[PDB]
Amino acid sequence: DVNTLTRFVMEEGRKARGTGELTQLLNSLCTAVKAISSAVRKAGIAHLYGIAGSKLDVLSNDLVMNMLKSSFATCVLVSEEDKHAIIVEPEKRGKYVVCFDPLDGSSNIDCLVSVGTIFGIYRKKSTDEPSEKDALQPGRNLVAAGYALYGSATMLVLAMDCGVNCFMLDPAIGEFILVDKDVKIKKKGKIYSLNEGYARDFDPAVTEYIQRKKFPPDNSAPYGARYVGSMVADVHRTLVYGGIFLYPAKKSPNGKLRLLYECNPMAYVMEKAGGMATTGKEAVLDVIPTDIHQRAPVILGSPDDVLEFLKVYEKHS
Amino acid sequence: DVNTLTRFVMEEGRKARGTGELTQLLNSLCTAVKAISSAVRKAGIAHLYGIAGSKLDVLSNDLVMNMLKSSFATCVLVSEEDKHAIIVEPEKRGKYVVCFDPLDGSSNIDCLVSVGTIFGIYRKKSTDEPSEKDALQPGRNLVAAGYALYGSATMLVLAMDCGVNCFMLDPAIGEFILVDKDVKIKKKGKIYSLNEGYARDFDPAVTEYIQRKKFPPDNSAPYGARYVGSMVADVHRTLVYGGIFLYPANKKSPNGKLRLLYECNPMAYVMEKAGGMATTGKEAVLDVIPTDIHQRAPVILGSPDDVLEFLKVYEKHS
Amino acid sequence: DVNTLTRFVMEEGRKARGTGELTQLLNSLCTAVKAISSAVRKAGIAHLYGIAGSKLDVLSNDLVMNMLKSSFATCVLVSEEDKHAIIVEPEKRGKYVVCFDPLDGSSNIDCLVSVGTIFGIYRKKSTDEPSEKDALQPGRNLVAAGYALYGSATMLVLAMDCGVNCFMLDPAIGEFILVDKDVKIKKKGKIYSLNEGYARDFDPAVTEYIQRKKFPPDNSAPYGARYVGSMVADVHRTLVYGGIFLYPANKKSPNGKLRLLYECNPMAYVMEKAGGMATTGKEAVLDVIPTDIHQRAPVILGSPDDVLEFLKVYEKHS
Amino acid sequence: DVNTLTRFVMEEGRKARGTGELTQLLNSLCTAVKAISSAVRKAGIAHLYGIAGSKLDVLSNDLVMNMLKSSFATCVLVSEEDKHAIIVEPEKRGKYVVCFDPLDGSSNIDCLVSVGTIFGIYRKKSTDEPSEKDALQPGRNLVAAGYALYGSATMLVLAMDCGVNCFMLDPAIGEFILVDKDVKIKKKGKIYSLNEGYARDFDPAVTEYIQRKKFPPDNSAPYGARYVGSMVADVHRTLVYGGIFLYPANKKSPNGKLRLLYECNPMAYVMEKAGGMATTGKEAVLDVIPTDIHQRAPVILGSPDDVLEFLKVYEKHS
Numbered sequence A: 001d002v003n004t005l006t007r008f009v010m011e012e013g014r015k016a017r018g019t020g021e022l023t024q025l026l027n028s029l030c031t032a033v034k035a036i037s038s039a040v041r042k043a044g045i046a047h048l049y050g051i052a053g054s055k056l057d058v059l060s061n062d063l064v065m066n067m068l069k070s071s072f073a074t075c076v077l078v079s080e081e082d083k084h085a086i087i088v089e090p091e092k093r094g095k096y097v098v099c100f101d102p103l104d105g106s107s108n109i110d111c112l113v114s115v116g117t118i119f120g121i122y123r124k125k126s127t128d129e130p131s132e133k134d135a136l137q138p139g140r141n142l143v144a145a146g147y148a149l150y151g152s153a154t155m156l157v158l159a160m161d162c163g164v165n166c167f168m169l170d171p172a173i174g175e176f177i178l179v180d181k182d183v184k185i186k187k188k189g190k191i192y193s194l195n196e197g198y199a200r201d202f203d204p205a206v207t208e209y210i211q212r213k214k215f216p217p218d219n220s221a222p223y224g225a226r227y228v229g230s231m232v233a234d235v236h237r238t239l240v241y242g243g244i245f246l247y248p249a250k251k252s253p254n255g256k257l258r259l260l261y262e263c264n265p266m267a268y269v270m271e272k273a274g275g276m277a278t279t280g281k282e283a284v285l286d287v288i289p290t291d292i293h294q295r296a297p298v299i300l301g302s303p304d305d306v307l308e309f310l311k312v313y314e315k316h317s
Numbered sequence B, C, D: 001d002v003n004t005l006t007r008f009v010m011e012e013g014r015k016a017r018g019t020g021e022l023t024q025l026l027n028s029l030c031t032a033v034k035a036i037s038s039a040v041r042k043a044g045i046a047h048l049y050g051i052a053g054s055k056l057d058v059l060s061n062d063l064v065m066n067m068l069k070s071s072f073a074t075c076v077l078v079s080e081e082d083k084h085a086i087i088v089e090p091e092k093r094g095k096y097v098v099c100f101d102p103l104d105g106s107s108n109i110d111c112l113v114s115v116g117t118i119f120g121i122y123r124k125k126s127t128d129e130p131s132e133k134d135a136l137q138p139g140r141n142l143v144a145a146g147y148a149l150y151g152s153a154t155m156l157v158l159a160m161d162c163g164v165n166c167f168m169l170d171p172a173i174g175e176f177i178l179v180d181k182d183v184k185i186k187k188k189g190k191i192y193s194l195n196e197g198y199a200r201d202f203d204p205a206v207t208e209y210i211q212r213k214k215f216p217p218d219n220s221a222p223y224g225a226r227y228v229g230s231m232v233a234d235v236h237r238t239l240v241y242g243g244i245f246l247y248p249a250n251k252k253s254p255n256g257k258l259r260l261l262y263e264c265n266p267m268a269y270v271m272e273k274a275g276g277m278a279t280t281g282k283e284a285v286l287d288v289i290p291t292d293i294h295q296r297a298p299v300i301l302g303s304p305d306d307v308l309e310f311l312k313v314y315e316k317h318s
């Protein structure tokens, strides 16, 4: 039988005998994702160029903000686009915190590069009046997380306690069809992904690890290199094909990517798929944040590859 | 005032007082392209998972091949998908030879990477019965070339003598809308693109050129790196942002990886019409005389200051 | 705040502390409606005409039958297309009985007339093995009924004991957006709808009633006439503008042409929950106790003033 | 081979060795129709209902007026929405005059009735500076006409000297696929279509003919009745299934209701190229010489046997 995301998530919910708020949250999120996709693929563009005789990341944030508010399942919302946490109006408060990046990679959307939407969902932990502090949770607290990728097709990857499930958007009917069930990452890969133009500023251990991916001491074949420049695309490739992804800490002692709505959701997808994710000093999911836009270094992928990076990292520490 | 591809190409031909054949060719290609875009974004995929109770490479090739034949404007078709050249049947033959990759980058459609269609159009030059040899012309004989990119959005880039023009596919009405006219590549960029996993196979020229981009002897800012692994996406980003793209030879035969007829030549044509450059290292890509329809070539292309810098290094090691 | 079909129905169901099985049925039926819409608007027709080289009501039935079975919410399925009830196999069996017309008005799909999908849902009470007889229920046993209208736009109209709501399908995102809430029909309208070519076969009650709409007894403005010929379209215009719709018994004996279980009962239900009426002439449509799943019934529905007027003239003629 | 509007019309101009203006005109009109269809089907409607926090006849007229101007092929434009004809600015002037109804039948779009776009194309016969007089030609002077029907699917019907052809829109790729070539209407049909609610004001001529359809004298089968209320829908049905459609004179207007320049005349041309007829009662629609651009005309059209039969009943009563 064909299965959709809303049919999938309804059935886990019922079986957990819950209140329905998480299902309503994810439904609002799907409706947002479909709206973002239709605009990313430029559905309205002829009118902008004058067929009737006469902002993407802003619009994406607007979509995601309003759909989650309208779901009655949230109380605190943290977005890459907003300086402060948005507090949901009293009459619409539900019980979840949502940290998201509504259109990651769109810095370079000029070249029609792959972009995406990243989210992680926390159960509000305190009875207190909702505030920014309700988002300062370690990622090990997540009840759900994942991303939508607007690549050659549009796909939603949702991880939960039951595992990682991939849904393809069928744009002719507006339905997210379940196409890959309970996925698992290869225990060792053959690709490495990072920006080697920063090589002059590399941590000494990053330099050495990469140098071993190109010049293996042991007569194994070198790894191939891929780096789209957009995180949802580089991570999704690592899920599907295996390997390692690096945005590590030398200047930038904390990395460049943001912990709440980039590093933690991807670290959570990775671990539920049988993979790893480190800062180099601890698991990404074990960092306790003190600021909603704070940064974290991130290294994730197949577990044999991450463990190997850590081997070399520790030889330099 | 709004312009669409159909209207732009019809106008260029009208004041060229031509015969309509090329316009009929490009229109056929536009239909195929929009049909490919639909299938790549998966618009009927639910029927495939049983919604009513019960290969993207091959469909893309069928769509191009049938629509081109349909056009009455071609005689020889060369496709990445077919071992030998296709000869159009007598009753549908026109005067153009077409070389194309119907879905470049489809190797990695599994991870949903950008994919694209690349084409190059030649006037048949010989007066012989049409044959594979009609498609063995040097890239400098092209009358038209370009690519459809299925990325975050779907865009057609079309190069001709008039220059380079960029049309965005509006899916709501299914029309290609002119949005960047007579585009030109920046003289020098700040991004370099190549698969650095072949580092132990690069020749001394590539090795030194790369090192100049990470460690500038003039102490200017190092270049950033990007490599999608899908040629149409990397090349289009080179057009739009500047910089350089490379696929040099390696121990996968010293002949390079990318195909001359339907990958390197159409992109090199796009780049030179945009004020850029494209070299094998030994010669310009557009001057290679082919001997085989699927032969490979190495390519270094992009902004002109960046390819020239590459070429001054290559000369120092020559 | 924007609302949708999924969110509206999932909240009514949580409020009722139900099992969510009715929601599984409705979500699955909404999927089927969206694919029927796509096919009715001809979203792949170019492939049928050969662009790559190489039934609508049949496919609508296949869509509804397979989506309903996999909801795990039905046990007996009655369709205009099928001679007998279909009995869902044990492993997929749920408590609801559905009767539906998967693409009504399909006879004139050649002229691009509006068509639609009609449905009505009963709870199965007993403990017995499911059987065709479980669908032989009066329409007052309905827990939900409605229709999808494929007109200038596609719209879903859904009636439950909480009232009638109307959801517009947004093709760009594939979502049913609530646009009219808790809808109520005009007390009295100014339009009447029937196939008047059967004038020579009308009951005297119908002929007087019609002549009272053209030569009214009180110098009212005569009514206008509209008859599209596709039931879903005629009934929806009646819901939105007011007036009366009639399919009486011509030669067809005091029986008429339309079908009681999957045409007459769902529209009678939508009319009554929206404050209208529906009568056979002799009784309320929703009171008829049926003995055959494909039995027919006379039907007269619309604004309550207009139906009371006809029923007044009807009684004078008995 | 699969054929599209743009390829059909382009090949028609080639054989005539034309200037490209009429092809430009129809290309721009098709683009306007695709955007109308997307709008009519409510493609971005959720944004209206607050999905991101923060008209239809106006938009259609805007789309048609702007695309026609941008086509470089027109000089005077008449639309139902504008009291005065639009004069195209000198820079953008071409040789054609277009009369159109941008969204016919839009009044009752709220009940999701079929709607459509009607057009008629004349060549400017005069010599002086272009003026509203350039639209006051008889329908006999028409170079081409037709309509778009926004029904269950969207179809453009196209009429010129080579006959009538029907192109279906495939919304997945936005191409108009030719699906019925050189169509011709049946010699005699079995359907009559008119607003019978105004029977109290009928000409004695149509009250006899209409009774001949419900009580045939030879005791053959009586006709069926259909009236949508939307001209483009009722007329398309007549073209496809045969029969007769009526909006006659009486005293609601001695000159009927529909407008001659952009409703009756395009539909009279389509019919006559299809082997049908179109009369005012007094004369053939296409022979009236207008004196006002917005003037009205009675219309009786359809299958030729049917219309001659109406004419005789009308010849009798005068």
Ligand SMILES: COc1ccc(S(=O)(=O)NC(=O)c2cc3c(Nc4cccc(OC)c4)ccc(Cl)c3n2C)cc1
Pocket: A009, A010, A011, A012, A013, A014, A015, A016, A017, A018, A019, A020, A021, A022, A023, A024, A160, C018, C019, C020, C021, C023
């Ligand atoms: C791990 O994945 C998830 C995903 C979502 C959730 S949830 O919080 O949003 N709950 C739902 O979705 C949910 C609950 C539910 C439901 N409850 C129920 C049943 C029996 C007794 C009872 O007394 C407490 C309650 C009945 C019918 C239905 Cl259709 C239901 N649905 C959809 C939780 C975990």
Ligand SMILES: COc1ccc(S(=O)(=O)NC(=O)c2cc3c(Nc4cccc(OC)c4)ccc(Cl)c3n2C)cc1
Pocket: B009, B010, B011, B012, B013, B014, B015, B016, B017, B018, B019, B020, B021, B022, B023, B024, B160, D018, D019, D020, D021, D023
């Ligand atoms: C540089 O870009 C291009 C693009 C396309 C072509 S072409 O070969 O396909 N020709 C066309 O497209 C074309 C030609 C044409 C046309 N010709 C014409 C005019 C006057 C005299 C004459 O007697 C020989 C012929 C008239 C009207 C129209 Cl609407 C036309 N169209 C569309 C060539 C170059």
Ligand SMILES: COc1ccc(S(=O)(=O)NC(=O)c2cc3c(Nc4cccc(OC)c4)ccc(Cl)c3n2C)cc1
Pocket: A018, A019, A020, A021, A023, C009, C010, C011, C012, C013, C014, C016, C017, C018, C019, C020, C021, C022, C023, C024, C160
């Ligand atoms: C009038 O409209 C309708 C429409 C549909 C239905 S239903 O049969 O299809 N079931 C649902 O809808 C449903 C139920 C449900 C649910 N149950 C629940 C709640 C509290 C106590 C309890 O202890 C037995 C059970 C929890 C969470 C959620 Cl999200 C739920 N949903 C969606 C009923 C009426």
Ligand SMILES: COc1ccc(S(=O)(=O)NC(=O)c2cc3c(Nc4cccc(OC)c4)ccc(Cl)c3n2C)cc1
Pocket: B018, B019, B020, B021, B023, D009, D010, D011, D012, D013, D014, D016, D017, D018, D019, D020, D021, D022, D023, D024, D160
């Ligand atoms: C009733 O059917 C129609 C439909 C449209 C038109 S038209 O006015 O718009 N012309 C066109 O469409 C047209 C013309 C044309 C063309 N002309 C030509 C050929 C030879 C000598 C010459 O010396 C002046 C001119 C060449 C190539 C092409 Cl591809 C052409 N096209 C498309 C007219 C009638």
